[PDB]
């Protein structure tokens, strides 16, 4: 299971000002950037060309080059068609990719208007998603008249997207299968509740994403353990914290247990009150302003 996504964001401030920015993610590694400031899709990995030839890449890059300038000018004209209806500023988002599976896939192209998902390319044409505004019917009828675009979109969604990704997965096999070891430390904070403490188990610098983290008393996993969101790191690693709320006093005898692939069995076990936890804590002292109140 691997999802390849081209995310595009276009801003239209008024009748003349506009910018379109796009990024490209495979799984959760950014492979391509293309800023409005540049007229060239940039590789962000030494393997972002996949298994494509130079001449194969130029044709695809030019395809999109024509697209960017055409897209902008199309939206502008549609706004003019719905002159009194919709008006600036207008925000458009395109999410277009394909998900890989024994040589089988499913492609998609989703379009959003003002942060809301309204249109997708389904089969041979554009389609208004149930729960779309009724004013969109005309502009869709206008776009569907283009036999030429429909042809190119279909070729990309049906054939090109899957053919390209298969190339990226073998070209980027090395990077997508890499193993980075997480490091952990401990801390605490006042709970929202009177006379309670929230303990924090910081896990940072690990790859890949999936990871198990739990506060425990020996064999018993504390059920109150809350998983935080996964937070990014510049070097494409991950930061995740697991918290535990406790009544000031239950703190000792607890432990933070971290399981990850890159450890291979040797789990990280931080004990609240160990000579190691103590040495770490005095290395991180501070005036405590402006702490989160």
């Amino acid at each position: 299971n691997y999802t390849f996504r081209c995310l595009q964001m276009s801003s239209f401030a008024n009748r003349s000002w506009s910018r379109t920015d796009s990024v490209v993610w495979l799984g959760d590694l950014q492979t391509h950037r293309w800023s409005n400031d540049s007229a060239t899709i940039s590789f962000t990995k030494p393997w972002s060309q996949g298994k494509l030839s130079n001449q194969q890449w130029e044709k695809l890059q030019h395809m999109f080059q024509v697209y960017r300038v055409s897209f902008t000018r199309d939206i502008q004209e549609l706004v003019k068609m719905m002159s009194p209806k919709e008006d600036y500023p207008i925000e458009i988002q395109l999410s277009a990719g394909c998900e890989m599976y024994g040589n089988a896939s499913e492609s998609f192209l989703h379009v959003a208007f003002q942060g809301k998902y309204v249109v997708r390319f389904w089969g041979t044409s554009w389609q208004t998603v149930p729960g779309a505004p009724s004013w969109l019917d005309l502009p869709i009828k206008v776009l569907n008249a283009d036999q030429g675009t429909s042809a190119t979109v279909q070729m990309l969604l049906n054939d090109t997207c899957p053919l390209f990704v298969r190339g990226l997965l073998e070209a980027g096999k090395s990077d997508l299968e890499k193993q980075e070891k997480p490091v952990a430390w401990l801390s605490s904070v006042p709970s929202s509740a009177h006379g309670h403490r929230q303990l924090v188990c910081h896990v940072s610098g690990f790859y890949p994403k999936p990871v198990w983290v739990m506060w425990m008393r020996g064999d018993q996993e504390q059920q109150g353990t809350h998983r935080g969101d996964f937070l990014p790191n510049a070097d494409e690693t991950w930061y995740l914290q697991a918290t535990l709320d406790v009544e000031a006093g239950e703190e000792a005898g607890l432990a933070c247990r971290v399981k990850h692939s890159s450890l291979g069995g040797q789990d990280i076990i931080l004990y609240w009150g160990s000579l190691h936890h103590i040495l770490d804590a005095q290395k991180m002292v501070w005036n405590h302003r402006h702490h989160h109140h």
Epitope: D74, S83, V142, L143, A145
Partner: T-cell receptor, first 113, second 106 residues
Amino acid sequence: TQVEQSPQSLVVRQGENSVLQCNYSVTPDNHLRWFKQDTGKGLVSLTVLVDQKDKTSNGRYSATLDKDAKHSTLHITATLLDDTATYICVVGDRGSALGRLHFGAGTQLIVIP
Amino acid sequence: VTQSPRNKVAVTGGKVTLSCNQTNNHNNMYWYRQDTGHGLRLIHYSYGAGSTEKGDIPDGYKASRPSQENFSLILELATPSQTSVYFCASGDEQFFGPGTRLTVLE
């Protein structure tokens, strides 16, 4: 200009073959169309060229398009007197209602009896 | 796709309207002008009843679309430079009107 035609004027003997050229730089290039304009009237569509390498044919008129060359050619086999008109090359950037046509300056065909 | 007037002699600073009427049920209409050495250039165009949009050279020109059928080019103050042959068009493939020869004098 984005649509260039050659020559300025073409003079052919009646009952011979006349050839007209068109060169464009319009990106993108959805289709191409040749119009006929009689002296003192409007433009009338002779033929369209849609494909990457297209070749159309209507009556004595026949046209060819090469989108990689960005170029087109109109042929009139066995030119008549009544073919004395201006011929206009037009390229249309989009294949929808949101398109914008680009007009060449035209070629004046004069047929000598 | 009818045009009226077919011919017009105007003075500098005089108000001139060029009408254009079509019964094809088309939403899009255009106003071009032809000048020797150039090839047709876009003045004003419309996406429907109540729409008017500037083209490549809208200066000295105003447009109006009262109904689906009609689309007029209004010249408030006329210039000698606005002496040209004006073509109207409709359609989504365009269809071109007979033309209007307009001379504006000092």
